[PDB]
Amino acid sequence: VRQIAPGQTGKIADYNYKLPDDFTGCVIAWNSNNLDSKVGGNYNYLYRL
Amino acid sequence: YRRPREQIIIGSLWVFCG
Amino acid sequence: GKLQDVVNQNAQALNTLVKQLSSNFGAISSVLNDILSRLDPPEAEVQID
Numbered sequence: 645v646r647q648i649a650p651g652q653t654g655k656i657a658d659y660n661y662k663l664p665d666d667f668t669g670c671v672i673a674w675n676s677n678n679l680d681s682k683v684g685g686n687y688n689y690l691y692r693l
Numbered sequence: 694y695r696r697p698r699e700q701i702i703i704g705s706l707w708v709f710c711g
Numbered sequence: 712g713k714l715q716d717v718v719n720q721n722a723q724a725l726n727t728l729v730k731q732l733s734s735n736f737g738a739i740s741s742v743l744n745d746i747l748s749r750l751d752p753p754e755a756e757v758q759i760d
């Protein structure tokens with residue numbers, strides 16, 4: 645979540661969602677473990693690698 | 694793509710292109 | 712010597728102008744390709760500027 649920001653480098657920040665260097669706007673983040681996670685593991689989410 | 698600064702006043706130059 | 716100084720001063724100003732391309736001006740390199748082939752784009756602009 646720290647890596648969704650302008651000028652960041654890495655796996656997801658460059659292969660999934662790259663923000664512009666002069667990006668204007670806001671980044672929203674909040675905890676979702678108690679709703680997005682289920683017993684046995686949740687496999688409904690995919691990311692490019 | 695990268696758009697010219699003339700067409701965008703406040704926003705970022707880069708626009709959705711996927 | 713009156714005519715020689717004009718030739719000397721004019722050529723000395725061009726030699727100084729070209730020799731200014733081998734300076735860093737507070738950056739990390741003078742060759743521009745080195746900056747663009749060693750650093751990521753977000754921090755390459757500040758070195759180029």
Ligand SMILES: *[C@@H]1O[C@H](CO)[C@@H](O[C@@H]2O[C@H](CO)[C@@H](O)[C@H](O)[C@H]2NC(C)=O)[C@H](O)[C@H]1NC(C)=O
Pocket residue numbers: 711
């Ligand atoms: C809009 O539709 C066209 C037509 O399908 C797409 O053009 C194809 O793009 C793919 C990959 O970019 C190429 O492999 C094809 O050769 C292109 N032509 C055709 C006839 O398929 C275009 O990519 C689509 N654009 C968007 C934004 O969806």
